[PDB]
Write an enzyme that holds these catalytic residues in place. Structure first.
Site, mmCIF file in Angstrom:
data_model
loop_
_atom_site.group_PDB
_atom_site.id
_atom_site.type_symbol
_atom_site.label_atom_id
_atom_site.label_comp_id
_atom_site.label_asym_id
_atom_site.label_seq_id
_atom_site.Cartn_x
_atom_site.Cartn_y
_atom_site.Cartn_z
ATOM 1 N N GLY A 198 61.920 28.934 49.128
ATOM 2 C CA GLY A 198 61.430 30.109 49.861
ATOM 3 C C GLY A 198 61.704 30.071 51.355
ATOM 4 O O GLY A 198 62.185 29.081 51.896
ATOM 5 N N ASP A 238 59.198 13.803 50.306
ATOM 6 C CA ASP A 238 60.314 14.234 51.103
ATOM 7 C C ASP A 238 60.106 14.190 52.583
ATOM 8 O O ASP A 238 60.356 15.162 53.325
ATOM 9 C CB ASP A 238 60.689 15.646 50.640
ATOM 10 C CG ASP A 238 62.175 16.038 51.018
ATOM 11 O OD1 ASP A 238 62.995 15.187 51.272
ATOM 12 O OD2 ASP A 238 62.448 17.311 51.059
ATOM 13 N N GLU A 292 63.757 27.739 56.357
ATOM 14 C CA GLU A 292 63.603 27.601 54.911
ATOM 15 C C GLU A 292 63.151 26.205 54.515
ATOM 16 O O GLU A 292 63.786 25.244 54.907
ATOM 17 C CB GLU A 292 64.920 27.903 54.221
ATOM 18 C CG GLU A 292 65.330 29.365 54.364
ATOM 19 C CD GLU A 292 66.384 29.769 53.371
ATOM 20 O OE1 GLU A 292 66.314 29.289 52.218
ATOM 21 O OE2 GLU A 292 67.264 30.580 53.735
HETATM 22 C C1 LIG Z 1 59.514 22.778 56.301
HETATM 23 C C2 LIG Z 1 59.514 24.093 57.139
HETATM 24 C C3 LIG Z 1 60.584 24.925 57.040
HETATM 25 C C4 LIG Z 1 60.630 26.146 57.785
HETATM 26 C C5 LIG Z 1 59.596 26.410 58.625
HETATM 27 C C6 LIG Z 1 58.466 25.630 58.730
HETATM 28 C C7 LIG Z 1 57.323 25.861 59.638
HETATM 29 C C8 LIG Z 1 57.667 26.088 60.942
HETATM 30 C C9 LIG Z 1 56.524 26.251 61.847
HETATM 31 N N1 LIG Z 1 56.849 26.470 63.119
HETATM 32 N N2 LIG Z 1 55.254 26.121 61.532
HETATM 33 C C10 LIG Z 1 54.918 25.929 60.235
HETATM 34 N N3 LIG Z 1 53.775 25.679 59.648
HETATM 35 C C11 LIG Z 1 53.902 25.474 58.339
HETATM 36 C C12 LIG Z 1 55.243 25.524 58.075
HETATM 37 C C13 LIG Z 1 55.704 25.251 56.712
HETATM 38 N N4 LIG Z 1 56.085 25.092 55.631
HETATM 39 C C14 LIG Z 1 55.944 25.742 59.267
HETATM 40 C C15 LIG Z 1 58.417 24.378 57.985
#
Ligand SMILES: Cc1cccc(-c2cc(N)nc3[nH]cc(C#N)c23)c1
Ligand SMILES: [Cl-]
Length: 261
Positions: free
Chosen positions: A19, A120, A15
């Site tokens: 969202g 942030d 998260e």
């Molecule tokens: C800040 C956040 C929270 C939860 C998941 C993710 C995320 C994890 C991931 N392995 N790849 C991603 N690419 C964009 C993300 C976003 N927002 C994202 C990033």
């Protein structure tokens, strides 16, 4: 088993500020992306997301509104977050921290150069691709601080307390760039010590007072080599007009020190 047009939503990645983020895999092509799912401000975020084109910033692929739900498709970071590479109480090897720091500065210089502040910066929002290249993620709190070559001061309090600059707690309005610089300094401390230095950079916080009085014989500072510590002394400066800017970080001794693990 949920899906969006050609994509299946196969697992939760976590998260963000608002969202949930899901791993989305295309049924046809097998391409995997990340998709942020918002219910029921998002016009702003989309406007900012479409501006982003840099190797140290998560790319936006586009969006789809179905009912209540909005889907923002973005580059997937298959290496997970920087948070998961920081060993508690230890940090990570200095050469790995230096490399991640260089990449974080490249991303922040990019953002600032297009007049965008992230607001942030912290290890949970700093993701890694399959080659461990850093990508700055989550533009839910991001905003414009320069438009038509005119800077606008910020006044809204946002961020995450341990990462937030002291001006943001003490001033009605403040400049955007030194706040993102400060948070990058706290990131650097986390990387090198596996510990955050203070709960918040306020007068009621004893660990922050300790730092202003230069008690670097205490943790986390005693874990950090004098050369990166000298950089942290220039970043984590209370007065934002006295604090080091990115162009001068690029001149720092530690920043330019050749390192290998
Ligand atoms: C800040 C956040 C929270 C939860 C998941 C993710 C995320 C994890 C991931 N392995 N790849 C991603 N690419 C964009 C993300 C976003 N927002 C994202 C990033
Ligand atoms: Cl940490």
């Amino acid at each position: 088993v949920p899906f969006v047009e050609d994509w299946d939503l196969v697992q939760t990645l976590g998260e963000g500020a608002y969202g949930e983020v899901q791993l989305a895999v295309n049924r046809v092509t097998e391409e995997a992306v990340a998709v942020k799912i918002v219910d029921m401000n998002i016009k702003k975020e989309i406007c900012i997301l479409k501006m982003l084109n840099h190797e140290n910033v998560i790319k936006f692929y586009g969006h789809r509104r179905e009912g209540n739900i909005q889907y923002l498709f973005m580059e997937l970071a298959s290496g997970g977050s920087l948070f998961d590479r920081i060993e508690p109480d230890i940090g990570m090897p200095e050469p790995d921290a230096q490399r991640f720091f260089h990449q974080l500065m490249a991303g922040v210089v990019y953002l600032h150069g297009i007049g965008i502040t992230h607001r942030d910066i912290k290890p949970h929002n700093l993701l890694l691709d399959e080659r461990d290249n850093l990508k700055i993620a989550d533009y839910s709190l991001a905003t414009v601080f320069r438009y038509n070559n005119r800077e606008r001061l910020l006044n809204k309090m946002c961020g995450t307390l341990p990462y937030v600059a002291p001006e943001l707690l003490k001033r009605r309005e403040f400049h955007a760039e030194p706040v993102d610089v400060w948070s990058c300094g706290i990131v650097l401390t986390a990387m090198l010590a596996g510990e955050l230095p203070w709960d918040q950079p306020s007068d009621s916080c004893q660990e922050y007072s300790d730092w202003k009085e230069k008690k670097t014989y205490l943790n986390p500072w005693k874990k950090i080599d004098s050369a990166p510590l000298a950089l942290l002394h220039k970043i984590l400066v209370e007065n934002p007009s006295a604090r080091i800017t990115i162009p001068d970080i690029k001149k720092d001794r530690w920043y330019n020190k050749p390192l290998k693990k």
